[PDB]
Structure formats: C-alpha cells, structure tokens
Amino acid sequence: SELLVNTKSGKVMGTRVPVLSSHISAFLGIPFAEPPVGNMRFRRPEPKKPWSGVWNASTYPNNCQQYVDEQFPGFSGSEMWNPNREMSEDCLYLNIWVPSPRPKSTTVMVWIYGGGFYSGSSTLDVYNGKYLAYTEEVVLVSLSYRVGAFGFLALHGSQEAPGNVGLLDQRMALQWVHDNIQFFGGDPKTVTIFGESAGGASVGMHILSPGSRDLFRRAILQSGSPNCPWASVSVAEGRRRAVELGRNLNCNLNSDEELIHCLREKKPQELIDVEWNVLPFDSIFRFSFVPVIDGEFFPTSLESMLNSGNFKKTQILLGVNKDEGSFFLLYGAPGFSKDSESKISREDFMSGVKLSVPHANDLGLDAVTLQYTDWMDDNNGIKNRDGLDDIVGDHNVICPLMHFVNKYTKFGNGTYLYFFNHRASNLVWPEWMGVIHGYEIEFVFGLPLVKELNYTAEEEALSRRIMHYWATFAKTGNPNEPHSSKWPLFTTKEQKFIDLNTEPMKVHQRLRVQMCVFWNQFLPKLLNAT
Amino acid sequence: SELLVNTKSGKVMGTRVPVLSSHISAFLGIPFAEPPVGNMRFRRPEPKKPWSGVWNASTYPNNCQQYVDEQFPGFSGSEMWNPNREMSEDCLYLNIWVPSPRPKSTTVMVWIYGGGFYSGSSTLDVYNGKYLAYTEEVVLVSLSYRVGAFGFLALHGSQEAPGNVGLLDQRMALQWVHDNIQFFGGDPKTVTIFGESAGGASVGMHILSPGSRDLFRRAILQSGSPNCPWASVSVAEGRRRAVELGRNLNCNLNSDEELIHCLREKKPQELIDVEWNVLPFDSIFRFSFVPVIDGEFFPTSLESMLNSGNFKKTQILLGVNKDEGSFFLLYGAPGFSKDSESKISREDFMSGVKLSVPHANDLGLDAVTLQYTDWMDDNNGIKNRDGLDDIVGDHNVICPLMHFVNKYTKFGNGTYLYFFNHRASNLVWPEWMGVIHGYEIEFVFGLPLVKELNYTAEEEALSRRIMHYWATFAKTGNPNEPHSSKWPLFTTKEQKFIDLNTEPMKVHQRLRVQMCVFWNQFLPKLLNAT
Numbered sequence A, B: 001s002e003l004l005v006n007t008k009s010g011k012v013m014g015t016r017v018p019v020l021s022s023h024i025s026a027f028l029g030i031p032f033a034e035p036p037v038g039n040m041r042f043r044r045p046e047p048k049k050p051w052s053g054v055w056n057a058s059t060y061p062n063n064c065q066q067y068v069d070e071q072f073p074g075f076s077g078s079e080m081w082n083p084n085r086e087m088s089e090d091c092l093y094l095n096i097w098v099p100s101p102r103p104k105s106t107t108v109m110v111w112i113y114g115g116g117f118y119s120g121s122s123t124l125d126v127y128n129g130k131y132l133a134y135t136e137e138v139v140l141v142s143l144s145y146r147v148g149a150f151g152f153l154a155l156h157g158s159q160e161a162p163g164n165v166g167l168l169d170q171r172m173a174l175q176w177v178h179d180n181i182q183f184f185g186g187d188p189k190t191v192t193i194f195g196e197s198a199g200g201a202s203v204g205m206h207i208l209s210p211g212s213r214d215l216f217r218r219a220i221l222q223s224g225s226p227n228c229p230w231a232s233v234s235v236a237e238g239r240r241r242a243v244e245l246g247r248n249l250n251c252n253l254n255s256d257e258e259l260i261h262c263l264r265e266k267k268p269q270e271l272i273d274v275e276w277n278v279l280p281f282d283s284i285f286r287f288s289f290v291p292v293i294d295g296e297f298f299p300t301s302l303e304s305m306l307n308s309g310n311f312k313k314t315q316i317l318l319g320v321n322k323d324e325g326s327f328f329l330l331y332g333a334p335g336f337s338k339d340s341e342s343k344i345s346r347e348d349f350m351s352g353v354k355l356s357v358p359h360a361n362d363l364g365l366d367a368v369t370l371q372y373t374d375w376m377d378d379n380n381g382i383k384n385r386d387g388l389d390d391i392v393g394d395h396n397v398i399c400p401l402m403h404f405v406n407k408y409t410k411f412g413n414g415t416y417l418y419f420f421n422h423r424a425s426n427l428v429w430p431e432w433m434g435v436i437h438g439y440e441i442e443f444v445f446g447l448p449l450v451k452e453l454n455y456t457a458e459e460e461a462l463s464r465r466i467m468h469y470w471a472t473f474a475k476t477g478n479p480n481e482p483h484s485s486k487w488p489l490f491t492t493k494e495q496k497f498i499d500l501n502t503e504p505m506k507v508h509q510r511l512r513v514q515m516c517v518f519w520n521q522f523l524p525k526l527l528n529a530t
C-alpha cells in the first residue's frame, strides 16, 4: 500500500524501517538499467526492461566490481568505505527512503558516492538515507554507477567502449528519478543532486554536460569539483591507458574491436588486479579510469565551458574540509603511519611533493617546495608533515573547487560556500590526520543523531544544523530559513563563506586565497612556459 | 714636525683640527695618482710623479665629475650626498686623520665611498674621519676613485678604455697606504678597508681580485657586496653601453679607437648629461657604468670565484639596514613622495616591481608579485608600499649580501653579521622610509657625539658602541673585547647575527632566509628556463 508502488518499469515492494523511535519506508535495490554484463561490458547503459510481478526492494543491491582496500584489514576507518555487499557487474540499482506517511510532492535529494571513480558503493553505513529523509522530510535517493575500467575504459571512436559510461549510468538513474519519483511522493522538478569527492566532481560534470542539465534542479558539491586534476583525462591518455590495460593482460592490440573482445573475456578481478599498472607516474590522488573529455558528454574542454558560461545556471552549495589531503599521504607517501605522529623528514618531504604533483617538472617541484617550506625551521617534522598535508588537499581539492566556485558564480543564480573543520570526538584516525576527506559525510547524513554511536550533544546539534542547511537549500535554493545567523551568498566581489563546526557560525572571506593563486594561476603558467 | 711628513712621493704639511674639545692632525687632499685627464681619460691610473716642495694638505680636494642630484634642491637629506667641493677630472686624492700625539704603529682604516659607481665624494660631512680617529685611536684614511663613464667605461680588448679603472684607482690608493702609512704612524700590515653600498661592493671586489688581496688585512662591508645585481656587468653589456654613449653623442662608432677619441674630446658634463640614456631598461637601483667581469681584475665569474674559495681568506664584518630600498622608490617609482605616507595602489605596485626587477620576464614578475602580495588584502596601500620597499632592499642588497656571507664563511677566518634597524630621532625623511640606505654611516663616523646635531644620549651611546666594534674588529679581527655582551661569530651551521640599535643586544639566526631563498635560488632558476 504505502510500501507497494507501481512504477513505469513495474511494481516494487519496499520495507518499513525503524528510524529514531519512528519508522519510514525504504525501497532498496531498484534496478534502473539492464545489467551491463557480458557483451555489454564497457557499453553505454540501456534502460531496464519492464518486469512483471513485484520487485522485492527490501534488501540492498550488489556493489559494483572494484579494487578492495586491504591496507588495514579489519580496521573500521578503512573498512567503512569498502563494499559491504557482494560485488557484481550486475550492480546498476538505486535506493529510496520515503517519509511516512508518504508526502504529496516533496523535495528530492539524490546522492552520488565518491571513491576516485575506481571504487564506491551506495550501501555504506554512512550513506544510510533514513535519518535525513525522516528528519528533514525529503525523499532521499542513492544511485550507483560503474567504476574502474567497467565504468571508464575509453577507446574514443569505438561505440563498444566509448568512455564515460559510468557518468551515463548516473544520468540514467537521474532519468529514472525524473520519470518515476512522483510515484514515491517526490517532486521531479525539485531534485537536488549531491555527492562527495568523485561524487562531487560528478555533480559538477552534470552541471556542465548538456545531456544532464534537464534532469535536476540544483546541486551540492562536497570536497570535489569537475576540474579536479584527478577527475578527467584526455581522449589520447584514456586510449593509452586502455591499450596498456590490454598489454598487461596479453591482449591483441591491433584494433579496438580485438582489444575490447579480449577485455570482455576476462573475469572482473583479472582487470582489477592490474588496474593501477596503467598510471603514467608514481603518484598519490591519481586514479586509472576516469571521465574523458570526449566532445560529447563534454562538448569542449572544461575550462572553455566554464569561461563561456556553457553550463546549467542554478543555485549551488559547496565546500571543503580542513585536511583533505591527510589519508592520501597515509596510503602512498613515505614516512606516514596511522599509528604514529608521522613526523616527516626533509628527504621524505621532497619525495612526497613529487608524488603529490606528479606532472610537474623540477622547477615546478621547486616552486611547490618553496611555497610550503618554512626556511627558518625546515627540519621541523610536524611542519613538514602538515605542509605535505596542505599540498595534497590544496592541489587536489580546495583550489580546484575555488576555481570552480569563482567561474560558476559569474553566471549562476546563487552560490553558498562552506569550510568544514570539526574533528569528530569518536574518530578512529590519529590526530595528525585532522578533519579527513569524507568525514563530513556522517554529519550530512545524520549519524550523530544515533545515540549508540557516541557523538557529543554538540555534534548532534551540528549534524542537525547541516542537515537543515542541506535540505532547506534543496527545497528553496537558499540554506537559510527566513527569520532567525544567516549563511551569506558567496559573491564575486566579497567571496564570503562560513565555517561549519560546533562553534557559532563565523563568516570569512577568500578561502585559502593565497595558496590557490599559486595552484590556479602561477603554477599552471610556470608549467606551460617551462 | 707632527704635521710635516715626508712621503715617498714628496713632503706634505697637514693641519691641526679641533675634535670634541681636543685636537688631532689632518692631512687632506694628498695626491696618489697622476691626474687622469686628456688622453688619460678612461685609462688605468698612473702613480703620482714625485713633487718638490711641500704639498699643502690643509684643504679637502676636488670631487670627481659626476651627475649631481637636483630632485630636491636645497633639501639637506639629498644635498648631503652631493659633491661639496668643485668637481674636476683631477680628483684622485686621499685624506688622512692621525691621532695626536702621533701613534707608533697603529691600526689603519680606509674608507671607500658609495654612490652606485656613478657618484660619491670623500669629502662629505658624514665621512669626516676625525671623530672615529680621535675616539678609537686609529689612523683613518678616505680614498677617492673615478665614477661614471670616467671610471667604468669598458671596451674590452682596448687598452685605452679597458674598464674597471675606478677600481684600479682604489687599488692605487691602497698601494699608496701600503707604501706610506708608516710615515703617519699607521701599520701597513693591519689595514682594514671599509665602505658602504658601492663602497661595500668595492671592498668585496678587492677581496676577490688577486691584484688587490695583498694590500689590506681585513674588511668591513656595509649594505653592499660584490655580487649585487647592480654592481657589475658583462664585457658584452659594458661594450653595448659604451657604444650607446657614443651614439648619444654622435660619435664615429666604426672602431674602439675612433669611439674613444670622440669621447675624450667631449667636456665632462657632456658625458654626464647622457649617462642615464645607455641603461637597457626603465629601472631603479641600476647604474650605467659599473665594474665589468673582465678576466683580469676578476679572473672568472664572481660566482665561480665564491664557489671555489678563490679569494682572500681573512675576517669580515658586514651587514644591512632595515629599509635599504626606500629612497630608491622615492626617486623613481610611481606613487612615492617624500611629503606623504606614499600609500601605493595595486596598479602602482605592479609598475614598481617591473622597475625593481627590470631583467625579469613576465613569469619572473608574477613570481615576485606572488611572493610579496597578501592576497587577503591586496588593496592595502601600506602593505603595497612596504612590500615594494622590501622587494627593492631584498633583491638589491640584503639577499646578495646573504649569498656572499654564506659563500665566504665556508673558507674565511671569521664572519660577523649585523642588522642595523635604528631610525634616527633627528631624521629629515618621512617615517615610511624607515631605516634608510646610508643612514648607518653617521653612526659609524661618530656624528651623534656632536652635541650640536641634537642626537639623543642613547644615540651617542649607540654610535660609541658601533665605533668600538668597528675599530676593535679592525685591530684584532674580532669586534668584541675579551671581557664584558658578546657579538657571536656567524657560522655556516647556526648563521647568527645581531641587531644594532639602542636596545640591549639581541642575537638572531638566518637573516631574511625565506625571501633570500626566493631571490638567491628559485628566481634565478626560473629566469634561466625555456
């Protein structure tokens, strides 16, 4: 009744779920695509053919095939991001939380997970949509999309592996929401897409892409933006990496057809076991199979589209965390450890700068080093550690996002910018890692409202504040409720943003402006000239 | 008797001068070279031919021909640097102050004036040697040398205008002191050469040049060093500037012989009136006719000599003032005025860095700008003003001297480094100009001991401290008297220096190390790329 919904592709039966001493409706694992298996590996997705009978939507779906992180086996801080369901190429499903009783036509929020375009799952505990759906009375959808080679192997000119098909998975789930969310009490004209890291870059890519623009109303980007250096490659580099994948697996490389036929014969984990081998440099915060600037999903270069205003004009809300770079250093840079303060020697600092800016020549590396080194105190291991942390976060997340925010605001209809700098009281990671990439998600999704998880009362209040900003923005284009302190519009001239933490809101201006002139203006000019 | 001295070139008669309620002997205007006039213009100096009779040495000599500064007619702050005697090409003279009664064999200090190698006079009020000679019981000499085209026109390969003849003037005066100062009670084995700005660069140039090394014992460099960017040119650039001088005067340019012959026929003022026209760029802190790296006075490049230890190994005392760049901006950069706070707009800032680093390409100018701009507050006219001030001082004086001191200390026998940051209570210049290039000289020469000049008691104490440091260093190679606070040696590892001011001594380390990494390491590497 409330749990039995007839959609344009067939009937679905959801389940009644408890939430915070109440209940709401969950529809888990609804298919929005034909399974992209067999001959459909690497191909654009196809709409799900209608089914007869009742689709059982009581259980989370499979997760897409991906490299599983084993660096810290059994450690919750890393395991919380790994697939928690069986992995399968048959993974194109979405999940829906609906307030109970079903509202008439309410705001919809669609979550796009991150994971560097090589990993990610809609089913992680921190993406549980029920607290936000219940607390803010929104219809909350989480989609899925192919990652790694399965989603982003790009042999431009082939229609069998054109590239960007994981972005097209996202778009097909948005099309399904557009066509069906009315049956779940959602308003298809008031859909907000939001996501973090690669999911934030994805949100920005749909803002840019003409074929995506009519499938949502407004957007939220968390710790990612479409212009991030890791978020896309050229057609030539994508082809190079695809050919090198075939080389690693002893494939015929004489033609796209023969290469693709070979790759389609391999078991999924065979592809995954060599995926990191196709990267051109030793690096951190770089991923093998990512979106390609193809001339179709992206009609021209990202920068030209931003400069000309060739993008969807709407409201955006976006922001970054204080220490975006810290876990990346843990995973690939010398001298870092989860079990120590990770004081970094001068030698390991120089190695880390090179891993962090792998495309830079030696003069570019010198420029980065000078910008982040205190030459009154250059053997300070804490300053070396924190300097590397800032390099990774500034280069890969904060300054790309500030470039996006300044270009977008010239043409958009409203920008709201935040700086999340609260360290959770119950964090399992060491203090040197600070406010880590991804650790605002648990506040956005209301996990501190769960007493059993042992957040402080101020952390519950912060989460409620953030959920209300997010959902009020989603409903109206403005995070502030009329009548009371106000989160001010970010403007080209004043460039205001707010901190998000347990203290009373403070307004600041020009987020990280000094370092981002270096990353966005000077270093690109230096690398181009040298 | 005491005032009658027979030298190797002939007899001289000095004069008895009052000083601080006592008296000392002065020997003013002693010739040490043949007048470099007529066909001797531009040529190496010749020793003064012996004279008969008694040279009347009671009067200051003529000053060398030079561009006279008329920017502020009648203003003492600028007029105090202009020639105060008649100008003449017949200007190669020296002055000697001798304690009374005549000492037996005492320490000698020889002053080399600055003035950008285009100006300067031994006879300025602030170079009056009588207070230092009387107070510290030293024999004090001030020499002279040809400036401008007369001293540094350079047509390499010609023996008629080889370049560097002003430096050979200085060397001939050092040779005269070596041969004759014993007759005045001075020890030729304990001669300290000291000088400021171009005079300080000159002192460092005699440290490097083999033909000079044996003519002094130890050295003091004030706000100047031999590697300063304004202090030398290549043989090719020296030739270009010489030919351009001839072009400005409608000279035959077909050979060095004809060019030189044309220039020797011109009145001195004719050369001076076009001197500034040969500079390659609009600039500040750049001078037309300066030492040339010739393969003779300087056997190889300054950097290669510093790197190999090819220089005199002895003790040095050297340092800088807080605001070296300030008067240079007043003289040639937009927005600066002696009669205002000189708050600098962003537009005038950009023009100022271009005038300050004239040799830099656009990428280099961006790098300077980024290094000295606070992008949280880029329209602050006070920050823009002080940033430009720092740029001029760091690039032209402080960081070249810090490079010299770090290279010298690897091979030398004792380095003492100071930072002079006292603004005089009776200064005639506005507050924004701070601690100005040249304004430590009056303390070195003891002018605050003259009650009539209205220095404070604390400033007289500071002057007495500085004169005792300078003279104790001259006598012993160590500015400290073994018995009490102590000025520590500058070492490669700890890099210590002291402030010089009216407060109790502070020891610091790594003088302006952050900016000097930029000027000494990064920017040269940037400018040398594709």
Ligand SMILES: O=C(Nc1cc(-c2cn(CCNc3c4c(nc5ccccc35)CCCC4)nn2)ccn1)Nc1cccc2c1[C@@H]1CCCCN1C2=O
Binding pocket: A069, A077, A078, A081, A114, A115, A116, A119, A196, A197, A276, A277, A279, A281, A282, A283, A284, A285, A286, A327, A328, A331, A332, A436, A437, A438, A439
């Ligand atoms: O894995 C590699 N590099 C790497 C991984 C990552 C990485 C790891 N993870 C784990 C995912 N978990 C987390 C997520 C987030 N936050 C986290 C916070 C803490 C811990 C895990 C997190 C937020 C966004 C969602 C995901 N994400 N990114 C980031 C940057 N570089 N390199 C690698 C792995 C195997 C083999 C090789 C390599 C390298 C690559 C370079 C060439 C040579 N290599 C190999 O052969």
Ligand SMILES: O=C(Nc1cc(-c2cn(CCNc3c4c(nc5ccccc35)CCCC4)nn2)ccn1)Nc1cccc2c1[C@@H]1CCCCN1C2=O
Binding pocket: B069, B077, B078, B081, B114, B115, B116, B119, B196, B197, B276, B277, B279, B281, B282, B283, B284, B285, B286, B327, B328, B331, B332, B436, B437, B438, B439
């Ligand atoms: O004079 C010019 N520039 C300039 C002068 C100077 C300059 C002036 N002076 C006066 C000397 N007096 C002082 C001294 C010292 N301190 C002083 C402190 C305050 C005032 C005068 C001082 C300490 C060292 C001894 C000298 N010294 N340096 C410094 C840097 N740039 N440019 C100029 C002049 C005439 C014509 C032209 C130009 C420019 C040159 C560039 C090309 C175009 N130009 C001209 O046509």
Ligand SMILES: *[C@@H]1O[C@H](CO)[C@@H](O[C@@H]2O[C@H](CO)[C@@H](O)[C@H](O)[C@H]2NC(C)=O)[C@H](O)[C@H]1NC(C)=O
Binding pocket: B015, B056, B057, B058, B059
């Ligand atoms: C050397 O020159 C000085 C300076 O002109 C002569 O001394 C001046 O002489 C006049 C009268 O002859 C006195 O009124 C001044 O007081 C003197 N000034 C100084 C500074 O001494 C001196 O007589 C000359 N001696 C000679 C020519 O033998």
Ligand SMILES: *[C@@H]1O[C@H](CO)[C@@H](O)[C@H](O)[C@H]1NC(C)=O
Binding pocket: A056, A058, A059
């Ligand atoms: C749907 O699946 C769940 C678990 O697999 C089960 O508990 C439920 O009864 C199923 N409903 C059906 C088959 O109608």
Ligand SMILES: *[C@@H]1O[C@H](CO)[C@@H](O)[C@H](O)[C@H]1NC(C)=O
Binding pocket: A412, A413, A414, A415, A489
């Ligand atoms: C958004 O657009 C409306 C209508 O064009 C305009 O009135 C409003 O000022 C805009 N707001 C912003 C923040 O651009």
Ligand SMILES: *[C@@H]1O[C@H](CO)[C@@H](O)[C@H](O)[C@H]1NC(C)=O
Binding pocket: A452, A453, A454
């Ligand atoms: C949460 O707090 C309760 C109450 O003290 C405690 O029993 C439980 O172990 C805590 N859980 C965690 C994961 O810290």
Ligand SMILES: *[C@@H]1O[C@H](CO)[C@@H](O)[C@H](O)[C@H]1NC(C)=O
Binding pocket: B412, B413, B414, B415, B489
């Ligand atoms: C100076 O040289 C002497 C002679 O070798 C040496 O004993 C002394 O340690 C040196 N002093 C410094 C400060 O280098």
Ligand SMILES: *[C@@H]1O[C@H](CO)[C@@H](O)[C@H](O)[C@H]1NC(C)=O
Binding pocket: B452, B453, B454
């Ligand atoms: C010194 O001060 C006195 C009184 O304060 C004044 O008469 C005299 O002119 C001053 N001298 C100078 C050189 O300024």
Ligand SMILES: [Cl-]
Binding pocket: B323, B386, B431, B432, B433, B434
């Ligand atoms: Cl100042």
